[PDB]
Each structure stands twice: as C-alpha cells, then as structure tokens.
Amino acid sequence: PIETVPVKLKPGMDGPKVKQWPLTEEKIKALVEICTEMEKEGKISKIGPENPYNTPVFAIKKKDSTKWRKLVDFRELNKRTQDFWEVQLGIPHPAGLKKKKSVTVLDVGDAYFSVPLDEDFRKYTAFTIPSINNETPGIRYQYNVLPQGWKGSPAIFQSSMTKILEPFKKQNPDIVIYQYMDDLYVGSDLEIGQHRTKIEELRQHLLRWGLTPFLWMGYELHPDKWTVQPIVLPEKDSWTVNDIQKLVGKLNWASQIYPGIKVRQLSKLLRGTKALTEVIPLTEEAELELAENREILKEPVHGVYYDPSKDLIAEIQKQGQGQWTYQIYQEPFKNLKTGKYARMRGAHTNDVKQLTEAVQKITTESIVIWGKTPKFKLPIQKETWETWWTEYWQATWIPEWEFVNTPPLVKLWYQ
Amino acid sequence: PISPIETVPVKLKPGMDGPKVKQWPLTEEKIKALVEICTEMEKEGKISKIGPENPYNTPVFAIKKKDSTKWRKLVDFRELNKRTQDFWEVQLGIPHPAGLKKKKSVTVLDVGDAYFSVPLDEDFRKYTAFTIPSINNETPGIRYQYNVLPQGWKGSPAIFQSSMTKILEPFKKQNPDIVIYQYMDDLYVGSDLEIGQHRTKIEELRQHLLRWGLTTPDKKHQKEPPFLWMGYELHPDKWTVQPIVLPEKDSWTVNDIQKLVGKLNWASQIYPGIKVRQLSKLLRGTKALTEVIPLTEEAELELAENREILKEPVHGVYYDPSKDLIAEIQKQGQGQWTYQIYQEPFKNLKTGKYARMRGAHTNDVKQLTEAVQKITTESIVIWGKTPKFKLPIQKETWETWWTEYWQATWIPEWEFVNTPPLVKLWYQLEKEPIVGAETFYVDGAANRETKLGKAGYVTNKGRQKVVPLTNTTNQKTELQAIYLALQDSGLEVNIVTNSQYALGIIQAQPDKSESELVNQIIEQLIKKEKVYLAWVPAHKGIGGNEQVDKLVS
DNA sequence: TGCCCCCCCTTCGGTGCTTTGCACCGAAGGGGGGG
Ligand SMILES: Nc1ccn([C@@H]2C[C@@H](O)[C@H](COP(=O)(O)OP(=O)(O)OP(=O)(O)O)O2)c(=O)n1
Ligand SMILES: OC[C@H]1O[C@@](CO)(O[C@H]2O[C@H](CO)[C@@H](O)[C@H](O)[C@H]2O)[C@@H](O)[C@@H]1O
Ligand SMILES: [Ca+2]
Ligand SMILES: [N+]
C-alpha cells in the first residue's frame, strides 16, 4: 500500500544499453541462486527482448566476507537518471564526518527492497544473466522494487530513513550519520568499545523496523588519522650533475602548482657541458634558491577549495615496490588532496589487485570528505584492467574511470 | 485466428509510420516458385490475405536453401527495421564443443518452420504487408500480412529465441539430470542415462514442443553419431570441425585472399600453428576486390606451412571439470602467437592464435600479455574459469618487466616452459648515470613550413655533431639526435634529451616498431652494454641542452 | 537479393597530448562461421 515515486530520465537521453560481460562459474552460480530467490519474493521479474535496455551485472565478496553479494553496474543508468538534487531529495554532506576518530560503514541496501519502484521506470533497470559456454541464451530480468546500487534508491528511501534514525539521532546527538548509495557512514569520537557498542545498537535498531551482504557487517575507518603526501625535495650535501638536472626538472614541473619557485640560480650551475656523475658544489645564490623553494612547498597552494558543482578527478601513479601515489583535484594543478599507499594487499605480486584496492581507498576517502565519487585516470591498459578488476572488487559502488599512459619522466610525487 | 503461444508486444519508434517501398521487378522463374509457397502459409494459418485497408508494403524475393531443393522466402524489411523499436538480443555468444562435457547419450533436433510457429504481435501485423506479382504485373495480385515471425525482420530472431526458452524452461527445471544447448531452432540434448530412458525423455520433449505448436521432423532428427552440430562433428570421446575447403586457385584476387584468411582463422580453433601474417599482409592497400595480387615468397611459404597442418585430421577432446585447465603459448615470430588449451597432455580441448598488432611500438612481453588476456576471456566464456599458463618467458624476465613498467600489469598463476624461442627483454636502461661514460646532450628541431631541420649532440669530452635533415618533423629530429648519440658512442653512454616524445617510446623497451627510425634505435640499444637516459626541460639554460638547442635551431 | 550473434584483418576518421605531428581507438567493411 505504498505509492510509487515517479522517476524520469534526463531529457534527450535514452536508457542504458550496455552489454553483459562474461562471468566466471562461481559468479554465475551465485547470481542464479540469488535471482531465483529474488523472483520468488517478487523483487525482480523475467522480461523479454522487447525491452531494449540492459545493464551489466556480476557478484562480489566484501572484505572478510564468505557469502556472495549481487552487484549491478548502474553507472550508465545513474548518469542518465535525473539528479535528485533538483527534486530536493539530495542528501547534504556533513563536514564533520571526516573529523571523527572512527567511522563505520554499514551496508543498508537490503532495506531498499521493501519500497516498490515506478512502473514506467522499471524497464530501465533491466539486466541479463549469461550462461557458461552459452548453453542458455540470456535470461533477462527487471526490478520491481528499489534496486541496490542505483542512485535513486537512497533518495526515495531517505524520507523513510530519517524516521528510522530519529530515535537514535536524538539519544546520541554527537554522532554523525551520512548515507551514500547502499552504505551508511556512522562516525563518533567515543572509545572504540563504546563506538562499536553504539554501532551494534544501530543494527538492532534497524531490526525493529525490519520486523515492522546483510546488516551484520561493518568496516572501521579513522579519518582523523588520514595524512597527505606533499612534494618533497631530497636533502643531499654533494650533488652530481644528474642530481641537479632531476631537481631542476622537478622544480620546473612543480612551478605549475607553486608559481613562486625559481630555478634561475640553479640552472646556471648547469652552464657547462659536464659529465652526469660529476659532483658540483652549490653557489651562494643557489643555496638561497633551494631553501626558499622548500619553504614555498610547505605553505599551501593559494586558491584551492572544493567546488560542489565540479566533478572530482583522481590520478594514480605506480611507483613500484608496492608504492602508489594519488592526487584528487577538480581543476588541474589545484589539488584538493594528495596521498600515498604502500604495503596494500597484493603488494610485490599483483599490480591490478593493488590498483583495485587503491581505487576503493580513494573513493572511500572522497565519500567521507566530499560525498562524491571521483573519476579515475588509471595507469593501466584498457584490456588489462577490464579482464581482472572484477576479481578484486570489494565495494558496493563503482566509480567512473578512464585509462592513461604517462611515462614518469620526472619522479614528482615519490623520490 | 488460433492462438499458439504467449505473444511479445512490439512497437514502432515514436512518430514513425510503417514502410512503403513497393516492389522491384522480379524474374519469372522466381515469381512462379513464390506463389506456391504463399498458398501453403495461408492453409496453415501463418498469413492472412485481407489487406485493402493496408497502405504499407515491403519488397519480397527468394533464394534457395543451402544445398537443398527448397526455395527460401525473404522480405526486405530494411525500411521496417529502421522504423521498428530496438530489441536487446538474448544471443550473447556461440557455444563451443570444447566446453561440452562427455555424455553417454546424445540427441540433436531441428524445429520445423520455427519463425512461422510463433504468433506475431497482433497490432504489428499490418506493417508486414507485402505484394507479389501475379503474372508479370498484368493483374493486380495477392497482398498479404504476416501472422507469425517473418524471415527478414530484425525482431524475428530475438523474439523466437526468447519464446523458445520460455517453453523449455519448465522441461529443464523438472529434469535437472539433462543438459540442453539451445541455439535458434537447433537443439542439443545430452545425458548419462541409458539410451532407452534417453529416447523416452527425447520423445517427452518432442511432445512438449508439440504442446506449444513446435514440430520436430525426423528428417532433421539426429540419433546416431557423428552429430553435425554448429559446423562440427561430435563423436562420443572426441570432436572435430567439419572438413574445410581451401581454394587452390592459381590467380589470386583480393576477394580470394579474404576468403583464404577467413578460413584459416576458422581452422585455427583446433589446427595448431596456423599463421596468416604474410597472407593478410598482401591485403593491406586500397586495392579493389577484383585486383589480382601475386603471392610473395614469404606468403607462399606461409600458405605451404598451413597446407601441411591441414593434411592430417586433428580432433579435440571434451571438458573435464575435475581437472585443471592448462594454456600453453608459443611465439611464432613477427608478432604471431599460437596457444593450446588442454587438461591432459597432447589431448587439446581447443587451440587458437593471437596476431593482433596494437600500437606503433611494442615488444614481445606486451604481446604475450595481450595473448594471455585473450585466452583468459576465451576460457571464462567457454568454461567459466582461468587456465594455468605455461609461458616461454622466464620468471626473472617477467619479474623485471612488471616491477619496472610504469603501467599496472599482471599475469595469472603461470609457470615457465623452456620452449624456444624464449621471450626476453633485449635491453635495459640504467636507473642511475654511468660513471666514466661519455655524456651526450642531444636535441633536434625542424621548420614547420619547410619541413627541413637539424639534429645533433654535444658531449662533455668536446665531441659535437650536427646533421641537416630534409622532409622531417620536430619529433623525427628528436629521435634522430638520440640515434646519432648511440651510433657515435661507446658501449656505455649517458644521453640527455628534452624530447618527451622520444623518451616515452624508448623507456617502454620496444623490440619492434612501425617506424624505420625507431627500429634502428632499437638495434643500437641491443648492441650497447649500459645506456642511461635523462630528461631536462627545454629553454632553461641547462647543461649542453641550451648549447645543442642553439646548434639545431 | 532479408534478419540476428560470435571471431580476425585492414582502413579511416575522430580525439587528445607526444601537439599541429603522432599515437590510440572504435566503427566499418572484407572474410570465416552459426541458425
Ligand atoms: N538464412 C536463414 C537461416 C536461418 N534463419 C532462421 C533460423 C531459424 O530460427 C529459422 C529457420 O526456420 P526453419 O524452421 O524453416 O529452418 P530450416 O530452414 O532448417 O527448416 P526446416 O528444417 O524446418 O525444414 O530462421 C533465417 O532467418 N535465415
Ligand atoms: O571499464 C570501462 C568499460 O566499461 C563499460 C561497460 O561496462 O562502461 C562502463 O564504464 C564506463 C567508464 O566508467 C562508464 O562510463 C559506463 O557508464 C559503464 O557502463 C564500457 O563502456 C567501457 O569499455
Ligand atoms: Ca528448421
Ligand atoms: N627548439
């Protein structure tokens, strides 16, 4: 007896028509078992070829989770679905979530299945389950309730969500709660035991609504312990010609971010035509030029602030030895955050696995700090990434990405 | 009329009306054979005659069935297809026999008049109107509309293939011990049951299909092996592709080579070692489809090597899920690679080849990575899992490559196989400058208008050179300056350039290039013992860079 | 002189940084195959 919220697409846009990619045996058995149970509960229904729309689908296992979790690549549908900020169903982002000592992420996507979906919009949520060796043609389904991973589900459910959270928000006014897609971010400054206690209270608080992948899992963050990776100039007392050449090339690049850096007195050290391994001392004017440049790299960049109307862009660099650097920005050279990852999972043996973990880590930080998911510039070949990335994905969302190929002519972010 | 099965709603694109294309002249031999087939569809109820209120029409023609005395009716619905709504095809791929498991009992069936056994959408039948000449356009003739799925409509294959699955879905769920491969109207059914219980379930399916208006004639009922299925021959323990005809013509046209390479690609799925590099290299060039091409000395040998592979009959085996999958790749040279997928040695499930040349500059290590990715996707398609790889590359070679490359790259669980020619890296750039090696400061420049330029170097030992270049570019002179330094240097050399373009190419350690100049640079790099490359910004008054920039500009 | 799907090989035009040359990629047209 719940009336459906009508949903429209962005004017001048058709529906998603993205082909289903091959799935491994373990993922197909997981989807067939899940989609059969979702069909009994009326949450999905079979469709035919008259529906021209389709969205890829596969399955994942979250961190330290042994059971499968259906995941739909609604990226193309989300871009074509009306932005709910214009219907005022948008969720404001609390600036204090990044300040709490601990933040726990909860998969609350299972609650969306209770709300029906607009009949005229169900045709866009179509997907297809493939068969091994194409034994059976595509078995197409479509959603009848709010699907997980769609940007419209938390917006429509937000009215229902704030009511369920009212008793807990009033008993604990110092706790920040943010909702993004199928996740619920809960942050507090309490002790770890009292924090997990308040988290367990919020779980059982949801079961009081459930009676009237599952909720039991949670992942702990510590945004107060998040650091940044600044540009650093190495400290040497004897410089070779090659050392100074690397330094001038690095400072020349860095001048695009810090316009106060000069290399006039350092370049004049490279006046002659010397062998690269020749050690050359620093002139008096060059010592002041180097010292003054380190001070500029300490102070912040002028005019760098977050614009809520612009997209976030993330670049990642493979530094080797399990090291990975990244920068988040909206306008070029106006970085909002820089960072470096090391000893992640898959280090020293799997680049695609480490890159997948880095993309997840960066997106999580972006959601906590700004409430957005950036578009990634991945240092990997297109075919290399699209072959393996699903095997290592452990998140309920999927960010936008493109592929680049930039040789590291200047070791800028990592010496 | 009678109602066969559950229909599918079909619409036109918004604001679009039906087709009005009329009919082209038809020869009398075809006009005569068409009116006979039209009467049969009226009798069975597949086509209605009333269409004076129908302003639409679509041209119709007819061609004979593949090596069969029957003529096929076809309607050129190309104008209707532009106006029909889009469908999502449920056909995602092609089944392969290498993915089949061994079964004790096998049966193959073909559905009679499949497209004509499924009711068309009621409201859409008006747009399928068509006219046929009665007697050379003397009299008006007979107009008709389709009451079933017509051959030539873009929605016919998807609608039939989906309705076929809905009918088989209850039979498959109530018989889990059975395996059914459905592809269009052809049916594969296999089980480990005794042939008596098998022929029983086969007839149960034959009645069930007849319980929805689908016939299964005995002329296409295959009961005895070898089963002809998807262009193969299915024996109980082995499978093989149907025989392949190689054109042996002495005067090769462009269209002949296209047919030749196409058949070699199809053969490479079970015949190992097929090469098509030199044969396809003859097709490159804007030549007409009728121009005769003489076969080169390398393409003639390549054709002869392929002929020797097809002389002996080869067979594949079936999949055993209890055993691991093994994929072994061999390098064939000139960017050619072949692979075999097997579970027990010398018993190949299938073979294949990767010869794609992507990028202007590459190496064998990149091409091997791409071949592994092709096999991985192919294996997930057929068997749903990634095979263990045996690669002709040493662990040390691969470790050095991926740890030092700036892009993320990886190969799944694999082991080394010492099958020459081994893939290796032909040179490695030092990470630190070489002590005691001469330092070359190279640069180039070219005039954007005259396409003339200079390229040279200057070293710390006083050595200099400048060379004038004609019909060149800024990028070519920058590459040329590096080539000059490599030619005029010892076995160990430091080279400082400002060319981002050249440094990006060389640092990726290519061993082959479409550019003659880059290949000559590669040849010099292999001769050297230690090479160090460094980049400096231009016009910054840095070392020899400011000096050599003046010499070449 | 029809429709639908998959594969490889070549060409061509669009795209974005290596920049106004060069490298990459996806579409398209040739062929193979299936029904
Ligand atoms: N050239 C072709 C070949 C096939 N088809 C599709 C594929 C299939 O879905 C259907 C053919 O229906 P039929 O049942 O008539 O197929 P046959 O020629 O084998 O006829 P028979 O054995 O029953 O005497 O139409 C098609 O459009 N055009
Ligand atoms: O990895 C990119 C690859 O994915 C596809 C199909 O799944 O598109 C998906 O990814 C794009 C890049 O983020 C999105 O723009 C798109 O919406 C999403 O479906 C392919 O288009 C692409 O090759
Ligand atoms: Ca048939
Ligand atoms: N220059």
PDB file of N, CA, C and O in Angstrom, chain B residues 117-156:
ATOM      1  N   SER B 117       6.182 -20.631 -36.485  1.00  0.00           N
ATOM      2  CA  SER B 117       5.431 -21.316 -35.440  1.00  0.00           C
ATOM      3  C   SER B 117       5.251 -20.456 -34.194  1.00  0.00           C
ATOM      4  O   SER B 117       4.863 -20.978 -33.143  1.00  0.00           O
ATOM      5  N   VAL B 118       5.506 -19.156 -34.292  1.00  0.00           N
ATOM      6  CA  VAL B 118       5.390 -18.237 -33.169  1.00  0.00           C
ATOM      7  C   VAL B 118       4.475 -17.088 -33.580  1.00  0.00           C
ATOM      8  O   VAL B 118       4.730 -16.429 -34.599  1.00  0.00           O
ATOM      9  N   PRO B 119       3.404 -16.813 -32.834  1.00  0.00           N
ATOM     10  CA  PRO B 119       2.467 -15.763 -33.252  1.00  0.00           C
ATOM     11  C   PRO B 119       3.099 -14.386 -33.137  1.00  0.00           C
ATOM     12  O   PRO B 119       3.730 -14.053 -32.131  1.00  0.00           O
ATOM     13  N   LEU B 120       2.922 -13.584 -34.183  1.00  0.00           N
ATOM     14  CA  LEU B 120       3.422 -12.224 -34.195  1.00  0.00           C
ATOM     15  C   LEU B 120       2.505 -11.328 -33.369  1.00  0.00           C
ATOM     16  O   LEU B 120       1.357 -11.673 -33.074  1.00  0.00           O
ATOM     17  N   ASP B 121       3.034 -10.173 -32.975  1.00  0.00           N
ATOM     18  CA  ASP B 121       2.228  -9.201 -32.248  1.00  0.00           C
ATOM     19  C   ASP B 121       1.046  -8.775 -33.107  1.00  0.00           C
ATOM     20  O   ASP B 121       1.204  -8.444 -34.285  1.00  0.00           O
ATOM     21  N   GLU B 122      -0.147  -8.794 -32.507  1.00  0.00           N
ATOM     22  CA  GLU B 122      -1.375  -8.571 -33.263  1.00  0.00           C
ATOM     23  C   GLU B 122      -1.366  -7.217 -33.960  1.00  0.00           C
ATOM     24  O   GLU B 122      -1.679  -7.115 -35.153  1.00  0.00           O
ATOM     25  N   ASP B 123      -1.007  -6.159 -33.229  1.00  0.00           N
ATOM     26  CA  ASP B 123      -1.072  -4.809 -33.775  1.00  0.00           C
ATOM     27  C   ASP B 123       0.011  -4.529 -34.809  1.00  0.00           C
ATOM     28  O   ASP B 123      -0.114  -3.563 -35.568  1.00  0.00           O
ATOM     29  N   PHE B 124       1.061  -5.347 -34.863  1.00  0.00           N
ATOM     30  CA  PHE B 124       2.183  -5.113 -35.763  1.00  0.00           C
ATOM     31  C   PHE B 124       2.021  -5.787 -37.119  1.00  0.00           C
ATOM     32  O   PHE B 124       2.768  -5.463 -38.048  1.00  0.00           O
ATOM     33  N   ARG B 125       1.060  -6.703 -37.258  1.00  0.00           N
ATOM     34  CA  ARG B 125       0.923  -7.469 -38.493  1.00  0.00           C
ATOM     35  C   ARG B 125       0.566  -6.599 -39.693  1.00  0.00           C
ATOM     36  O   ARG B 125       0.809  -7.011 -40.832  1.00  0.00           O
ATOM     37  N   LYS B 126      -0.002  -5.411 -39.469  1.00  0.00           N
ATOM     38  CA  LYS B 126      -0.383  -4.555 -40.588  1.00  0.00           C
ATOM     39  C   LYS B 126       0.833  -4.020 -41.334  1.00  0.00           C
ATOM     40  O   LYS B 126       0.760  -3.784 -42.546  1.00  0.00           O
ATOM     41  N   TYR B 127       1.956  -3.825 -40.638  1.00  0.00           N
ATOM     42  CA  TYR B 127       3.132  -3.237 -41.265  1.00  0.00           C
ATOM     43  C   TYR B 127       3.952  -4.254 -42.043  1.00  0.00           C
ATOM     44  O   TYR B 127       4.811  -3.856 -42.837  1.00  0.00           O
ATOM     45  N   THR B 128       3.709  -5.546 -41.837  1.00  0.00           N
ATOM     46  CA  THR B 128       4.398  -6.596 -42.571  1.00  0.00           C
ATOM     47  C   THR B 128       3.728  -6.899 -43.902  1.00  0.00           C
ATOM     48  O   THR B 128       3.918  -7.992 -44.449  1.00  0.00           O
ATOM     49  N   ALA B 129       2.945  -5.962 -44.429  1.00  0.00           N
ATOM     50  CA  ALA B 129       2.252  -6.189 -45.683  1.00  0.00           C
ATOM     51  C   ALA B 129       3.248  -6.275 -46.831  1.00  0.00           C
ATOM     52  O   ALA B 129       4.304  -5.637 -46.821  1.00  0.00           O
ATOM     53  N   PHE B 130       2.904  -7.086 -47.826  1.00  0.00           N
ATOM     54  CA  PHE B 130       3.782  -7.282 -48.968  1.00  0.00           C
ATOM     55  C   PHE B 130       2.955  -7.710 -50.169  1.00  0.00           C
ATOM     56  O   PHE B 130       1.899  -8.331 -50.023  1.00  0.00           O
ATOM     57  N   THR B 131       3.450  -7.369 -51.355  1.00  0.00           N
ATOM     58  CA  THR B 131       2.780  -7.684 -52.605  1.00  0.00           C
ATOM     59  C   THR B 131       3.665  -8.590 -53.448  1.00  0.00           C
ATOM     60  O   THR B 131       4.898  -8.519 -53.387  1.00  0.00           O
ATOM     61  N   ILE B 132       3.021  -9.441 -54.237  1.00  0.00           N
ATOM     62  CA  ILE B 132       3.717 -10.358 -55.133  1.00  0.00           C
ATOM     63  C   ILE B 132       3.093 -10.253 -56.520  1.00  0.00           C
ATOM     64  O   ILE B 132       1.859 -10.238 -56.646  1.00  0.00           O
ATOM     65  N   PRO B 133       3.898 -10.159 -57.577  1.00  0.00           N
ATOM     66  CA  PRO B 133       3.340 -10.083 -58.932  1.00  0.00           C
ATOM     67  C   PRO B 133       2.541 -11.335 -59.265  1.00  0.00           C
ATOM     68  O   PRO B 133       2.978 -12.458 -59.011  1.00  0.00           O
ATOM     69  N   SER B 134       1.354 -11.132 -59.831  1.00  0.00           N
ATOM     70  CA  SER B 134       0.518 -12.265 -60.207  1.00  0.00           C
ATOM     71  C   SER B 134       1.014 -12.897 -61.504  1.00  0.00           C
ATOM     72  O   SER B 134       1.437 -14.058 -61.519  1.00  0.00           O
ATOM     73  N   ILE B 135       0.964 -12.149 -62.606  1.00  0.00           N
ATOM     74  CA  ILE B 135       1.511 -12.618 -63.875  1.00  0.00           C
ATOM     75  C   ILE B 135       2.246 -11.473 -64.559  1.00  0.00           C
ATOM     76  O   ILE B 135       1.716 -10.842 -65.481  1.00  0.00           O
ATOM     77  N   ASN B 136       3.480 -11.211 -64.117  1.00  0.00           N
ATOM     78  CA  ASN B 136       4.314 -10.144 -64.678  1.00  0.00           C
ATOM     79  C   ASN B 136       3.608  -8.792 -64.616  1.00  0.00           C
ATOM     80  O   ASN B 136       3.637  -8.014 -65.572  1.00  0.00           O
ATOM     81  N   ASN B 137       2.951  -8.525 -63.487  1.00  0.00           N
ATOM     82  CA  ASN B 137       2.269  -7.259 -63.222  1.00  0.00           C
ATOM     83  C   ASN B 137       1.121  -6.990 -64.191  1.00  0.00           C
ATOM     84  O   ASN B 137       0.712  -5.839 -64.366  1.00  0.00           O
ATOM     85  N   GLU B 138       0.589  -8.038 -64.825  1.00  0.00           N
ATOM     86  CA  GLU B 138      -0.570  -7.870 -65.696  1.00  0.00           C
ATOM     87  C   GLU B 138      -1.820  -7.584 -64.870  1.00  0.00           C
ATOM     88  O   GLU B 138      -2.501  -6.572 -65.081  1.00  0.00           O
ATOM     89  N   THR B 139      -2.135  -8.468 -63.939  1.00  0.00           N
ATOM     90  CA  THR B 139      -3.238  -8.358 -62.997  1.00  0.00           C
ATOM     91  C   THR B 139      -2.714  -7.828 -61.663  1.00  0.00           C
ATOM     92  O   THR B 139      -1.501  -7.777 -61.443  1.00  0.00           O
ATOM     93  N   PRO B 140      -3.606  -7.390 -60.738  1.00  0.00           N
ATOM     94  CA  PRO B 140      -3.111  -6.753 -59.504  1.00  0.00           C
ATOM     95  C   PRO B 140      -2.272  -7.668 -58.623  1.00  0.00           C
ATOM     96  O   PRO B 140      -1.106  -7.372 -58.339  1.00  0.00           O
ATOM     97  N   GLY B 141      -2.851  -8.764 -58.172  1.00  0.00           N
ATOM     98  CA  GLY B 141      -2.134  -9.775 -57.431  1.00  0.00           C
ATOM     99  C   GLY B 141      -2.719  -9.991 -56.053  1.00  0.00           C
ATOM    100  O   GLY B 141      -3.794  -9.487 -55.708  1.00  0.00           O
ATOM    101  N   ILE B 142      -1.994 -10.776 -55.261  1.00  0.00           N
ATOM    102  CA  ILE B 142      -2.386 -11.148 -53.906  1.00  0.00           C
ATOM    103  C   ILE B 142      -1.522 -10.402 -52.896  1.00  0.00           C
ATOM    104  O   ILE B 142      -0.289 -10.499 -52.933  1.00  0.00           O
ATOM    105  N   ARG B 143      -2.163  -9.660 -51.995  1.00  0.00           N
ATOM    106  CA  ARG B 143      -1.473  -8.984 -50.904  1.00  0.00           C
ATOM    107  C   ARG B 143      -1.639  -9.790 -49.620  1.00  0.00           C
ATOM    108  O   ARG B 143      -2.633 -10.498 -49.438  1.00  0.00           O
ATOM    109  N   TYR B 144      -0.661  -9.677 -48.721  1.00  0.00           N
ATOM    110  CA  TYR B 144      -0.690 -10.476 -47.504  1.00  0.00           C
ATOM    111  C   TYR B 144      -0.072  -9.715 -46.341  1.00  0.00           C
ATOM    112  O   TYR B 144       0.636  -8.722 -46.522  1.00  0.00           O
ATOM    113  N   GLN B 145      -0.353 -10.213 -45.137  1.00  0.00           N
ATOM    114  CA  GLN B 145       0.293  -9.770 -43.910  1.00  0.00           C
ATOM    115  C   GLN B 145       0.725 -10.988 -43.105  1.00  0.00           C
ATOM    116  O   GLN B 145       0.072 -12.035 -43.136  1.00  0.00           O
ATOM    117  N   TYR B 146       1.841 -10.851 -42.393  1.00  0.00           N
ATOM    118  CA  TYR B 146       2.372 -11.958 -41.608  1.00  0.00           C
ATOM    119  C   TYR B 146       1.605 -12.100 -40.299  1.00  0.00           C
ATOM    120  O   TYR B 146       1.376 -11.114 -39.593  1.00  0.00           O
ATOM    121  N   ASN B 147       1.214 -13.332 -39.978  1.00  0.00           N
ATOM    122  CA  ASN B 147       0.626 -13.656 -38.688  1.00  0.00           C
ATOM    123  C   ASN B 147       1.631 -14.291 -37.740  1.00  0.00           C
ATOM    124  O   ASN B 147       1.288 -14.576 -36.588  1.00  0.00           O
ATOM    125  N   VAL B 148       2.858 -14.519 -38.200  1.00  0.00           N
ATOM    126  CA  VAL B 148       3.915 -15.143 -37.421  1.00  0.00           C
ATOM    127  C   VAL B 148       5.210 -14.377 -37.671  1.00  0.00           C
ATOM    128  O   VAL B 148       5.236 -13.380 -38.396  1.00  0.00           O
ATOM    129  N   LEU B 149       6.288 -14.849 -37.062  1.00  0.00           N
ATOM    130  CA  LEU B 149       7.582 -14.190 -37.206  1.00  0.00           C
ATOM    131  C   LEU B 149       8.092 -14.350 -38.632  1.00  0.00           C
ATOM    132  O   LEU B 149       8.268 -15.485 -39.092  1.00  0.00           O
ATOM    133  N   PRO B 150       8.339 -13.265 -39.362  1.00  0.00           N
ATOM    134  CA  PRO B 150       8.823 -13.393 -40.738  1.00  0.00           C
ATOM    135  C   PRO B 150      10.340 -13.373 -40.819  1.00  0.00           C
ATOM    136  O   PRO B 150      11.034 -12.784 -39.989  1.00  0.00           O
ATOM    137  N   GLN B 151      10.850 -14.049 -41.852  1.00  0.00           N
ATOM    138  CA  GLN B 151      12.312 -14.106 -42.092  1.00  0.00           C
ATOM    139  C   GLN B 151      12.723 -12.832 -42.837  1.00  0.00           C
ATOM    140  O   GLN B 151      12.294 -12.660 -43.997  1.00  0.00           O
ATOM    141  N   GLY B 152      13.503 -11.973 -42.173  1.00  0.00           N
ATOM    142  CA  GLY B 152      13.950 -10.724 -42.757  1.00  0.00           C
ATOM    143  C   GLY B 152      13.683  -9.542 -41.848  1.00  0.00           C
ATOM    144  O   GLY B 152      14.155  -8.431 -42.104  1.00  0.00           O
ATOM    145  N   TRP B 153      12.919  -9.773 -40.784  1.00  0.00           N
ATOM    146  CA  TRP B 153      12.602  -8.739 -39.807  1.00  0.00           C
ATOM    147  C   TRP B 153      13.602  -8.799 -38.661  1.00  0.00           C
ATOM    148  O   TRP B 153      13.906  -9.883 -38.153  1.00  0.00           O
ATOM    149  N   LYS B 154      14.122  -7.633 -38.264  1.00  0.00           N
ATOM    150  CA  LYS B 154      15.191  -7.602 -37.271  1.00  0.00           C
ATOM    151  C   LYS B 154      14.738  -8.134 -35.919  1.00  0.00           C
ATOM    152  O   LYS B 154      15.580  -8.561 -35.120  1.00  0.00           O
ATOM    153  N   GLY B 155      13.434  -8.121 -35.643  1.00  0.00           N
ATOM    154  CA  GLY B 155      12.912  -8.660 -34.405  1.00  0.00           C
ATOM    155  C   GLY B 155      12.622 -10.142 -34.411  1.00  0.00           C
ATOM    156  O   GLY B 155      12.357 -10.714 -33.350  1.00  0.00           O
ATOM    157  N   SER B 156      12.675 -10.787 -35.576  1.00  0.00           N
ATOM    158  CA  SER B 156      12.337 -12.207 -35.653  1.00  0.00           C
ATOM    159  C   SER B 156      13.294 -13.100 -34.871  1.00  0.00           C
ATOM    160  O   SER B 156      12.812 -13.954 -34.107  1.00  0.00           O
TER     161      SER B 156
END
